Amino acid sequence: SYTQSFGYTIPTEKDTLEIPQYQALLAKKASYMDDSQGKNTATYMNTAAPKDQPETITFGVNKVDNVYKQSNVQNQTFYASSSKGTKIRIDGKRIWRTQSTDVNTGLPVIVDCPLWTSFTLGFADFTLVDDSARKSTIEWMISQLELLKDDGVWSKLCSGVTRIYG
Amino acid sequence: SYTQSFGYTIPTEKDTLEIPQYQALLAKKASYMDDSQGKNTATYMNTAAPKDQPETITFGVNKVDNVYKQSNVQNQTFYASSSKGTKIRIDGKRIWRTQSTDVNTGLPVIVDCPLWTSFTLGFADFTLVDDSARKSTIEWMISQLELLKDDGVWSKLCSGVTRIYG
Amino acid sequence: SYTQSFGYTIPTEKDTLEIPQYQALLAKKASYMDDSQGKNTATYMNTAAPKDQPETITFGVNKVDNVYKQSNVQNQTFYASSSKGTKIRIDGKRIWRTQSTDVNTGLPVIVDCPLWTSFTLGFADFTLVDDSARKSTIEWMISQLELLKDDGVWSKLCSGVTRIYG
Amino acid sequence: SYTQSFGYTIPTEKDTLEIPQYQALLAKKASYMDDSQGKNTATYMNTAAPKDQPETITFGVNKVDNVYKQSNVQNQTFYASSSKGTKIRIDGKRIWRTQSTDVNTGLPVIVDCPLWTSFTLGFADFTLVDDSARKSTIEWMISQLELLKDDGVWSKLCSGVTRIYG
Amino acid sequence: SYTQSFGYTIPTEKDTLEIPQYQALLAKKASYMDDSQGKNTATYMNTAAPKDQPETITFGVNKVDNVYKQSNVQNQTFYASSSKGTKIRIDGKRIWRTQSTDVNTGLPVIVDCPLWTSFTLGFADFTLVDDSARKSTIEWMISQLELLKDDGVWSKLCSGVTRIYG
Amino acid sequence: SYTQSFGYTIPTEKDTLEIPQYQALLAKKASYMDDSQGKNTATYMNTAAPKDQPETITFGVNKVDNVYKQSNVQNQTFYASSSKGTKIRIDGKRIWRTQSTDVNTGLPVIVDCPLWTSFTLGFADFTLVDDSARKSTIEWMISQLELLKDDGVWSKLCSGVTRIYG
Numbered sequence: 001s002y003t004q005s006f007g008y009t010i011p012t013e014k015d016t017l018e019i020p021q022y023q024a025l026l027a028k029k030a031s032y033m034d035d036s037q038g039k040n041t042a043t044y045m046n047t048a049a050p051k052d053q054p055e056t057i058t059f060g061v062n063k064v065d066n067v068y069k070q071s072n073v074q075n076q077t078f079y080a081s082s083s084k085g086t087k088i089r090i091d092g093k094r095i096w097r098t099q100s101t102d103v104n105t106g107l108p109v110i111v112d113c114p115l116w117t118s119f120t121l122g123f124a125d126f127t128l129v130d131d132s133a134r135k136s137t138i139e140w141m142i143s144q145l146e147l148l149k150d151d152g153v154w155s156k157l158c159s160g161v162t163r164i165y166g
Numbered sequence: 167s168y169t170q171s172f173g174y175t176i177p178t179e180k181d182t183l184e185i186p187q188y189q190a191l192l193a194k195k196a197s198y199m200d201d202s203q204g205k206n207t208a209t210y211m212n213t214a215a216p217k218d219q220p221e222t223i224t225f226g227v228n229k230v231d232n233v234y235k236q237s238n239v240q241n242q243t244f245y246a247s248s249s250k251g252t253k254i255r256i257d258g259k260r261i262w263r264t265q266s267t268d269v270n271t272g273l274p275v276i277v278d279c280p281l282w283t284s285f286t287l288g289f290a291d292f293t294l295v296d297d298s299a300r301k302s303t304i305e306w307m308i309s310q311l312e313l314l315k316d317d318g319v320w321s322k323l324c325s326g327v328t329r330i331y332g
Numbered sequence: 333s334y335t336q337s338f339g340y341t342i343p344t345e346k347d348t349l350e351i352p353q354y355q356a357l358l359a360k361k362a363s364y365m366d367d368s369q370g371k372n373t374a375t376y377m378n379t380a381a382p383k384d385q386p387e388t389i390t391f392g393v394n395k396v397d398n399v400y401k402q403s404n405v406q407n408q409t410f411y412a413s414s415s416k417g418t419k420i421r422i423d424g425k426r427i428w429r430t431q432s433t434d435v436n437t438g439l440p441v442i443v444d445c446p447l448w449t450s451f452t453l454g455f456a457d458f459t460l461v462d463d464s465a466r467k468s469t470i471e472w473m474i475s476q477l478e479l480l481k482d483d484g485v486w487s488k489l490c491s492g493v494t495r496i497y498g
Numbered sequence: 499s500y501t502q503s504f505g506y507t508i509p510t511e512k513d514t515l516e517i518p519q520y521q522a523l524l525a526k527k528a529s530y531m532d533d534s535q536g537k538n539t540a541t542y543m544n545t546a547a548p549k550d551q552p553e554t555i556t557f558g559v560n561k562v563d564n565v566y567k568q569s570n571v572q573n574q575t576f577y578a579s580s581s582k583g584t585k586i587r588i589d590g591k592r593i594w595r596t597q598s599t600d601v602n603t604g605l606p607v608i609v610d611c612p613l614w615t616s617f618t619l620g621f622a623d624f625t626l627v628d629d630s631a632r633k634s635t636i637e638w639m640i641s642q643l644e645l646l647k648d649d650g651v652w653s654k655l656c657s658g659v660t661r662i663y664g
Numbered sequence: 665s666y667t668q669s670f671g672y673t674i675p676t677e678k679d680t681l682e683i684p685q686y687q688a689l690l691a692k693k694a695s696y697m698d699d700s701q702g703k704n705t706a707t708y709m710n711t712a713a714p715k716d717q718p719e720t721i722t723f724g725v726n727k728v729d730n731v732y733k734q735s736n737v738q739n740q741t742f743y744a745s746s747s748k749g750t751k752i753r754i755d756g757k758r759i760w761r762t763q764s765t766d767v768n769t770g771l772p773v774i775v776d777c778p779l780w781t782s783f784t785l786g787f788a789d790f791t792l793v794d795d796s797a798r799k800s801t802i803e804w805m806i807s808q809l810e811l812l813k814d815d816g817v818w819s820k821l822c823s824g825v826t827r828i829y830g
Numbered sequence: 831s832y833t834q835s836f837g838y839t840i841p842t843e844k845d846t847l848e849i850p851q852y853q854a855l856l857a858k859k860a861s862y863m864d865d866s867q868g869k870n871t872a873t874y875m876n877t878a879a880p881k882d883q884p885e886t887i888t889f890g891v892n893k894v895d896n897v898y899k900q901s902n903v904q905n906q907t908f909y910a911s912s913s914k915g916t917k918i919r920i921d922g923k924r925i926w927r928t929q930s931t932d933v934n935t936g937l938p939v940i941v942d943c944p945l946w947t948s949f950t951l952g953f954a955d956f957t958l959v960d961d962s963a964r965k966s967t968i969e970w971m972i973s974q975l976e977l978l979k980d981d982g983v984w985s986k987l988c989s990g991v992t993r994i995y996g
Binding site: 333334335336337338339340342343344345346347348349350351352353354355356357358359362364367372373374376380381382384385386387388389391392393399400402403404405406407409410411412417418420422424425426427428429430431432441442443444445446447448449450451452453454455456458460461463465466467468469470471472473474475476477478479482485486487489490492493494495496497498 | 510566621635640643
């Protein structure tokens with residue numbers, strides 16, 4: 001009987017995140033676009049957004065020759081038989097639009113500045129890696145954001161706090 | 167009275183994510199490490215993880231000279247003194263360790279392969295950029311993972327599916 | 333019995349400065365930030381200010397190898413046994429924000445220009461230097477500002493008067 | 499009707515500083531010295547101090563090409579013909595002299611070590627920069643010293659405490 | 665079922681050491697100095713001590729390629745799979761200062777002689793080691809000092825007794 | 831009347847360490863080995879541990895020609911009349927042995943990994959030093975370990991946290 005963990009027992013306590021179904025709407029209204037970002041990368045355009053303010057999400061997947069080099073494992077004994085790994089990447093570019101119409105001129109005044117986001121998950125290709133492992137670490141990042149607290153980890157990063165926990 | 171949106175009204179429907187409190191445990195047990203990894207960043211080590219299996223999280227914040235060059239927006243009619251924005255990045259590196267004991271010899275056998283994750287959010291520095299705006303796009307990415315479904319966007323990416331939506 | 337003074341008896345007369353408790357509010361709401369300015373320098377962010385208009389204060393302390401070289405003491409006899417000294421520095425960067433909302437467009441009009449301040453106190457490391465000495469000279473600078481008079485030393489500097497007293 | 503603040507309403511509570519009138523005595527007894535110390539500055543000598551223990555104050559004012567580059571402000575939507583500001587600097591150098599008389603020989607023994615201080619205030623040249631704005635930030639620094647407390651911010655800096663607030 | 669011990673059952677009897685909370689005060693008042701002492705070694709200044717009477721503690725950690733070689737293990741077979749181990753080191757340098765005013769001149773006469781201390785713990789980096797094992801060996805050293813007896817192991821070493829027990 | 835201190839009043843609060851009487855057992859069972867480790871250094875074998883699983887403690891004492899040079903003392907005058915000092919060192923080498931019987935053959939599998947510890951105290955050899963002074967500095971190190979809290983200074987060093995306090 002072999003037990004596999006991330007080094008510490010998964011915390012029992014659970015933060016609940018009520019996340020809007022952005023993905024559902026985008027999935028319904030998503031339309032293909034050129035694979036410009038990478039040959040292994042397919043860019044999509046979300047049709048739900050107006051033509052003059054587009055939101056686009058680009059998915060990519062790239063093999064990594066050696067996972068262990070980038071990462072920190074203390075002893076060479078522990079290395080798995082193949083160090084080959086796979087890395088996934090979701091890139092998104094959206095536009096925050098503020099608009100109102102001028103009283104003097106019927107023309108609408110429209111100022112829209114851009115925001116972009118990227119998520120990445122890389123993992124060794126080995127029979128030991130479970131979807132349990134990969135999903136747990138996705139959740140690990142999401143938790144690390146501390147989204148529940150309004151002035152939390154994410155807002156401190158946004159304001160410019162490099163050294164977060166001390 | 168200004169209507170400011172991302173181009174489409176935020177979906178009413180909400181996916182609920184029960185996420186373990188990884189961040190709480192890490193914040194309790196997080197210890198500072200010298201920022202070898204970045205010039206303007208801060209790398210932390212999680213003490214909860216066993217000493218031969220370290221887990222590390224690295225925060226960084228870098229400002230961006232021109233936000234509009236990357237992004238696809240109809241170039242717009244509002245004066246901007248500068249057009250520069252702040253980009254926050256979170257990099258985590260963890261270890262998925264699988265361990266057992268050799269039946270022949272009581273000394274255990276350990277194989278641990280590495281997994282890593284990275285989240286990034288860049289936004290134009292502007293007065294009109296709200297928390298509402300920024301946080302919404304963080305949630306937008308999280309939803310885009312389709313974490314609720316076992317056979318979701320994230321597992322397709324992990325399996326190697328570039329053209330996720332079609 | 334040895335007497336030590338700054339060369340002239342401290343003036344009995346006292347200017348009273350009613351200074352708002354900026355420091356109390358900042359101390360309550362101060363949050364750590366990267367030590368980017370110097371390795372011996374810790375930068376802090378004041379959370380009381382809004383995220384889109386941050387105020388930041390950065391403290392630093394640097395040893396000075398030889399204090400006497402910079403300063404003017406008439407005779408070499410008088411030099412203390414060690415010329416090693418210590419220098420402290422408080423740097424602050426805040427933002428003066430003027431805002432009103434446009435009648436034609438709901439969008440607020442926000443113009444905020446920056447202001448910054450720096451205080452520095454360097455002193456020889458020697459058993460002779462008292463906190464009495466250092467505090468007196470801090471007060472000496474503050475008095476030198478002539479804050480009580482509305483059109484005084486500080487406003488003359490601000491307007492551009494190099495030769496103040498003649 | 500425009501609300502112009504530093505991001506947070508000025509604290510009502512006021513720390514009262516009883517500061518000796520050093521500046522009054524110095525202004526009475528201040529004599530001009532040739533500005534060896536700066537190209538665009540003015541160095542003065544205080545005649546009240548004994549001749550073998552000089553005390554000097556040096557005023558300087560230099561304009562600054564671009565105020566916004568140093569400071570951290572969301573780059574903003576208001577036309578600026580130029581963005582340049584004026585920076586005032588006050589440098590004082592004084593001597594803390596400890597003197598006694600040798601008991602053996604009536605001739606006295608004197609050891610005097612040096613102390614120096616510098617105050618600086620830079621502000622964007624703009625119409626909206628008030629005295630209210632500038633003076634407030636001068637007071638802001640003075641408060642930040644926490645001079646009332648014997649074991650205050652200033653003494654911690656002098657002792658060598660970089661991370662003052664946490 | 666494997667049984668691991670140091671070689672002898674831990675003594676039930678316990679010496680109680682009432683140690684002043686030096687570390688607490690230092691932790692409160694410790695200011696980061698630049699890491700002159702080593703590449704992986706971080707030097708700390710204690711601000712509680714006066715600036716001209718400094719007390720500094722430097723922390724360090726170095727991996728050792730082969731633990732077994734330095735240490736005495738009777739047979740080769742019993743060497744573990746990987747002999748890479750980790751070694752920690754705490755260096756402290758403090759000042760015992762004697763001071764009294766000169767009778768002839770009030771200037772104090774101060775002579776301060778230094779005392780320094782170092783603690784080191786090196787352990788084979790392997791899964792079998794427990795914080796049980798490490799902490800026990802730390803306690804083992806501390807006990808070996810025989811601190812309770814005034815003329816004990818430590819005073820004898822200070823007094824030059826090399827061969828303590830015979 | 832001369833006053834001598836380390837620089838700060840000894841903290842009243844006391845951490846209580848319940849340390850097993852390792853030293854007592856060792857003192858009972860210590861057998862003199864030949865002093866291989868040094869000329870003025872006497873090495874001791876602990877007979878309580880089994881003969882093939884040895885634990886050895888070595889004591890040493892070396893004079894240092896000039897204490898002041900190694901240590902940081904701000905000014906030269908304060909150096910005492912003779913800088914010759916004395917330095918003591920306790921080295922211990924013990925064995926953490928893990929053993930289990932082989933399933934195939936009854937002959938046990940043992941693998942024993944080593945741990946070692948070293949404690950050093952150097953003090954200026956001069957009249958002014960007290961066993962008050964020296965015993966205080968020994969306790970100072972011991973407190974600095976933060977042994978009471980499980981994940982403390984020592985575990986962080988073991989875990990590689992060089993920059994403990996910030």
